Design a protein around this nucleic acid. Structure first.
Ligand SMILES: [Mg+2]
Ligand SMILES: [Mg+2]
Ligand SMILES: [Mg+2]
Ligand SMILES: [Mg+2]
Ligand SMILES: [Mg+2]
Ligand SMILES: [Mg+2]
Ligand SMILES: [Mg+2]
Ligand SMILES: [Mg+2]
Ligand SMILES: [Mg+2]
Ligand SMILES: [Mg+2]
Ligand SMILES: [Mg+2]
Ligand SMILES: [Mg+2]
Ligand SMILES: [Mg+2]
Ligand SMILES: [Mg+2]
Ligand SMILES: [Mg+2]
Ligand SMILES: [Mg+2]
Ligand SMILES: [Mg+2]
Ligand SMILES: [Mg+2]
Ligand SMILES: [Mg+2]
Ligand SMILES: [Mg+2]
Ligand SMILES: [Mg+2]
Ligand SMILES: [Mg+2]
Ligand SMILES: [Mg+2]
Lengths: 208, 99, 100, 83, 127, 116, 152
RNA sequence: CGGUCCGGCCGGGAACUCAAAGGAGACUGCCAGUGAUAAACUGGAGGAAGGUGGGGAUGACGUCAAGUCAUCAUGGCCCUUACGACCAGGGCUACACACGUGCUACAAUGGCGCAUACAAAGAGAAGCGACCUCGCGAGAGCAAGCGGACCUCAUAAAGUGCGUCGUAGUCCGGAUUGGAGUCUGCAACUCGACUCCAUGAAGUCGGAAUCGCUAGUAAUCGUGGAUCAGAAUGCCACGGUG
């Protein structure tokens, strides 16, 4: 293994964080623990709906969860019922008075997490992995991103030896530190094992 | 005087937050000294990155706490209620003390 | 690690924060300069009668997500591999790669 | 070494067992896992069956052992030789 | 009357105030011979006033902080040359020939990872 | 010349020649010269018998060669006949106070014996 | 190197005399970075040697070094089955380095009391055309004079 | 400038070091020659730095069935009143041997004692712990300041001045061993660190071979942090001479 995390190398310049707050040297670990509890809870619950990102933000002794999702219909459902049903239990998990903001994403076949869970769920319901990859690749290209590179890996539907496929198209420079490279990965649980999916999507270079 | 000491993680956000507090305090009170900077606390960490065995494979990370100090020398009766009313931005900690 | 080990560390934190009082009591009565000598003997003996798992020096610092014993970091609460995974996903604030 | 201000160290059950056995006065082996306890002169003249990990090795206490903790007379490892 | 120069070196910051005088080279509230215990360091202090003929023509007032003996002395030299180019302004070609104005851009190199120092690797061996 | 029954060197300095006895080292020798009033800048040459009388009294106040060798031999013998862990380690001939013996115990194991 | 043609390295002269040759000599004498003790050694040695010989330290050190400068040196070529050891005309800045290096190596190999006296005695012998440095120069030069045939 | 308890120390003062934030700046820009009118190179006047200024970060498609099922996740198999648990004690620290990586040395460019000067980076609340008293010391007791450009860790050392030592197993080296101890900790025997007194092994520059390094590098000297109740000759960093 060689490469760098392409989100972590751009955590400073172009990509923002996923948990922005401040602590002393005394409550830093407990902030991390309650953050990770609400992250695992939110992912496990609204995994049927397609979340994309979670901005955990705790301004001044109250928590705030901004859920970037694509389909708000399974997040909300009826007239603001399940969102408060989630909000009281986020307050229950973190122990703090709470807030939940729920935001949409436009073009839900362009972010890095959504394409990855699409290929993941298709591989769980047992489609051809080449059809899954090539479908997602040409969907992102006709949606108009500059680049996409997808890569599935391991136990590819009927093998004992585990090869690693990747397709690129467009242009997607990774050693550029000023690009906008949405990277994310995911795991498919099949009875052939764990099939790993990674996807880079280059949206556009950003200037100073 | 009430001294204001603002600690944060992002220098853009801390500049915007001290800008909003200095203009809100300037609108009401008188004799704000200035948003001075203090030494940025550069906490550092070294992690082995291999899960089993490589001593020669390491990353090093920093948490760069930026820290500003804004002084208010002549508070009126209501600037202290203005700042205790003022909800400050998400990701900036503040400490205020008269004396 | 094993789930018995994680619950074992929860047992240790429970007994430590339970008997935080009596330990400071008997260690004052041990370490004080002017003290009744049989009271000092009784302080040592009652300090033994306390359960051994109620020392703060007995709890190993586990990870707070996977219980890996070696490779802790106190300002994060997580092990080194999980803190690399979380820091590169971006769940820890202000944590970029230290280039100097 | 143990600090002089704390006195010596002997745990509750060996101290009580020693005092009961010296108030009675019998010669049976006092079976004892407490390897770390400082020998008192009220333990002089007794057989102490110190656990060495594997078995209960016996020591017959004399006047010379007045400060030495009990595991000095009980080698934990076993080394015959390499030849 | 006075002139100002900031000199910098490895970790030394020097403040030099040049005046016309008789030879008083006073550095941080103690004399030059009481400050520097090396004639090489005193040489590095008085080098540009050896290039020009102003050894006893001009006094000064010098503070310095940080660094070491030679680092402090090199910072003194840099501040003095900056102040002389502030003073007569015509010795720019002379100080460029002397190689004194050129701010010494060397620093302690940072110890990298896996290496015992800045560049020394440990004892590699095939077995 | 003689101090506590054993000769000391003559041309050397005072405490450096007084360190040449089994039992008085540099600190105890400095304390001896402090109690004697002879400062430590004199040689053993040009010292008179009154000063050697003071030194002999003050040195015999301590525990020096013969009694110290009885002390150490009786202490090691006590450990060995007691049969404690340090006694067992002394009669084996290995490092006592907790060193390692996978390598580097050569002060107690002497040279490196071949296996042939 | 292979690509770079690197020139020389500027070293500041001594505060005593201004001699770049003495700057090179105190650098070659100094070990473990402590320049001050080697400065004291070379200043004491030139002071006492000029006090014996009469004349200045600069002229005395220079002529006793000129009596131990090499003229042609030896280096391997190997190309047959045995090692050719061809002679090479030295460079006019490298002969200084060889002279001071052999002098300080003979001074370290000497058996005197202090290194000031070691350098003093070795450079007085190097003025009187005797000593270990002089014999080393003469034997390196005589090996080059033997292998004069490989001036191909 | 004032007032000086002579200590930036109190009125101050925006000039300075400094602390950040925003910038300007270095790009073959200018010149000459070579060069195919080109790419480019050899130079040099300017400039704080001349050609990538220096250092880091960034590790292409892939190779080695490389490593980890013991961070984690997981297909299958195996265990299920036990291969799962819980507790006490022991072991992971053994030792006729061999290797790897380091530290201390073998000394006079040095050792010892007495004074004297110059840093950078950091870390601190179950914590850092001044000042003052006691102990030769490790430390003890009292205990303000402090979430800290505020106080504490904390004296930097090599260096400088003087004295001494006289090339020796030495005033080198410090191992090992006995006694006496302080701290941490329920608990220092196996099995901690450190202090004091004493003891003072081998070693007098290293065969075959082999390694690191091109400049603030090598070499040498100190200091900190993480882990951490206590436990680094390591690891990660910072400066000093060079
Ligand atoms: Mg990498
Ligand atoms: Mg598990
Ligand atoms: Mg522990
Ligand atoms: Mg260095
Ligand atoms: Mg290593
Ligand atoms: Mg290796
Ligand atoms: Mg080898
Ligand atoms: Mg002795
Ligand atoms: Mg030019
Ligand atoms: Mg140029
Ligand atoms: Mg690059
Ligand atoms: Mg394999
Ligand atoms: Mg157990
Ligand atoms: Mg181990
Ligand atoms: Mg005292
Ligand atoms: Mg001396
Ligand atoms: Mg010798
Ligand atoms: Mg010694
Ligand atoms: Mg001693
Ligand atoms: Mg010998
Ligand atoms: Mg190189
Ligand atoms: Mg620490
Ligand atoms: Mg520690």
């Amino acid at each position: 293994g060689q490469k760098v995390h392409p989100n972590g190398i751009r955590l400073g310049i172009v990509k923002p964080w996923n948990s922005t707050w401040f602590a002393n040297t005394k409550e830093f670990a407990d902030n991390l623990d309650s953050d990770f509890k609400v992250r695992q809870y939110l992912t496990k619950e609204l995994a049927k709906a397609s979340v994309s990102r979670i901005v955990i933000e705790r301004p001044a002794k109250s928590i705030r969860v901004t859920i970037h999702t694509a389909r708000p219909g399974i997040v909300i459902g009826k007239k603001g019922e399940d969102v408060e049903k989630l909000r009281k239990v986020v307050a229950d998990i973190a122990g703090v008075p709470a807030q939940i903001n729920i935001a949409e994403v436009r073009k839900p076949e362009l972010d890095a997490k959504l394409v990855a869970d699409s290929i993941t769920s298709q591989l769980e319901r047992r489609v051809m992995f080449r059809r899954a990859m090539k479908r997602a690749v040409q969907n992102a290209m006709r949606l108009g991103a500059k680049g996409i590179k997808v890569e599935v890996s391991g136990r590819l539907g009927g093998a004992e030896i585990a090869r690693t496929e990747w397709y690129r198209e467009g242009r997607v420079p990774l050693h550029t530190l000023r690009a906008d490279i949405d990277y994310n990965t995911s795991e498919a649980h099949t009875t052939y094992g764990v099939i790993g999916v990674k996807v880079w999507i280059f949206k556009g270079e950003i200037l100073g | 005087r009430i001294r204001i000491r603002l600690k944060a993680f992002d220098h853009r956000l801390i500049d915007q937050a001290t800008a909003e507090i200095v203009e809100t305090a300037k609108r009401t009170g008188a004799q704000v000294r200035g948003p001075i900077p203090l030494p940025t606390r550069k906490e550092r960490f070294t992690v082995l990155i291999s899960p089993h065995v490589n001593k020669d494979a390491r990353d090093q990370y920093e948490i760069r706490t930026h820290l500003r100090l804004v002084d208010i020398v002549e508070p009126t009766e209501k600037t202290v209620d203005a700042l205790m009313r003022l909800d400050l931005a998400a990701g900036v900690d503040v400490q205020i003390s008269l004396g | 690690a094993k789930q018995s080990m994680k619950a074992r560390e929860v047992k240790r934190v429970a007994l430590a924060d339970k008997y935080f009082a009596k330990r400071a009591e008997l260690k004052a009565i041990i370490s004080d300069v002017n003290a009744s000598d049989e009271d000092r003997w009784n302080a040592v003996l009652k300090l033994q009668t306390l359960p051994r798992d109620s020392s703060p020096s007995r709890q190993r610092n586990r990870c707070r997500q996977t219980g890996r014993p070696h490779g802790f970091l106190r300002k994060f609460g997580l092990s080194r591999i999980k803190v690399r995974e979380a820091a590169m996903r971006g769940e820890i604030p202000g944590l970029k790669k230290a280039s100097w | 070494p143990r600090s002089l201000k704390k006195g010596p160290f002997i745990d509750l059950h060996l101290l009580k067992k020693v005092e009961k056995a010296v108030e009675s006065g019998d010669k049976k082996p006092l079976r004892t896992w407490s390897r770390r306890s400082t020998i008192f002169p009220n333990m002089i003249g007794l057989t102490i069956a110190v656990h060495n990990g594997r078995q209960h090795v016996p020591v017959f206490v004399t006047d010379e052992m007045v400060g030495h903790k009990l595991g000095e007379f009980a080698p934990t490892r076993t080394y015959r030789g390499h030849a | 009357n006075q002139y100002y120069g900031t000199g910098r070196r490895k970790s030394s910051a020097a403040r030099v105030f040049i005046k016309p005088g008789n030879g008083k080279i006073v550095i941080n509230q103690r004399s030059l011979e009481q400050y520097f215990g090396r004639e090489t360091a005193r040489m590095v202090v008085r080098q540009p006033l050896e290039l020009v003929d102003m050894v006893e023509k001009l006094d000064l007032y010098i503070t310095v902080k940080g660094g070491g003996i030679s680092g402090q002395a090199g910072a003194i030299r840099h501040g003095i040359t900056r102040a002389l180019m502030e003073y007569d302004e015509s010795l720019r070609s002379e100080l460029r020939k002397a190689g004194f104005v050129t701010r010494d851009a060397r620093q302690v190199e940072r110890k990298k990872v896996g290496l015992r120092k800045a560049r020394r690797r440990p004892q590699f061996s095939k077995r | 010349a003689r101090i506590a029954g054993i000769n000391i060197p003559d041309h050397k300095h005072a405490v450096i020649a007084l360190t040449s006895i089994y039992g008085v080292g540099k600190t105890r020798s400095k304390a001896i010269l402090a109690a004697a009033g002879i400062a430590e800048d004199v040689k053993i040459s040009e010292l008179s018998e009154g000063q050697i009388d003071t030194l002999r009294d003050e040195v015999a106040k301590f525990v020096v060669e013969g009694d110290l060798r009885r002390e150490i031999s009786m202490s090691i013998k006590r450990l060995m006949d007691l049969g404690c862990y340090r006694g067992l380690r002394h009669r084996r001939g290995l490092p006592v106070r907790g060193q390692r013996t996978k390598t580097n115990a050569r002060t107690r194991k002497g040279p490196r014996k071949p296996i042939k | 190197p292979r690509r770079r043609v690197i020139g020389q390295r500027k070293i500041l002269p001594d505060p005593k005399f201004g001699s770049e040759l003495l700057a090179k000599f105190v650098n070659i004498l100094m070990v473990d970075g402590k320049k001050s003790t080697a400065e004291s050694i070379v200043y004491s040695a030139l002071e006492t040697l000029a006090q014996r010989s009469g004349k200045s330290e600069l002229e005395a050190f220079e002529v006793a070094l000129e009596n131990v400068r090499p003229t042609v040196e030896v280096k391997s070529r190997r190309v047959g089955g045995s090692t050719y050891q061809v002679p090479v005309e030295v460079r006019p800045v490298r002969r200084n380095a060889l002279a001071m290096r052999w002098i300080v190596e003979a001074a370290r190999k000497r058996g005197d009391k202090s290194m000031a006296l070691r350098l003093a005695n070795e450079l007085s012998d190097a003025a009187e055309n005797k000593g270990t440095a002089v014999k080393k120069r003469e034997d390196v030069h005589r090996m080059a004079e033997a292998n004069k045939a490989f001036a191909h």
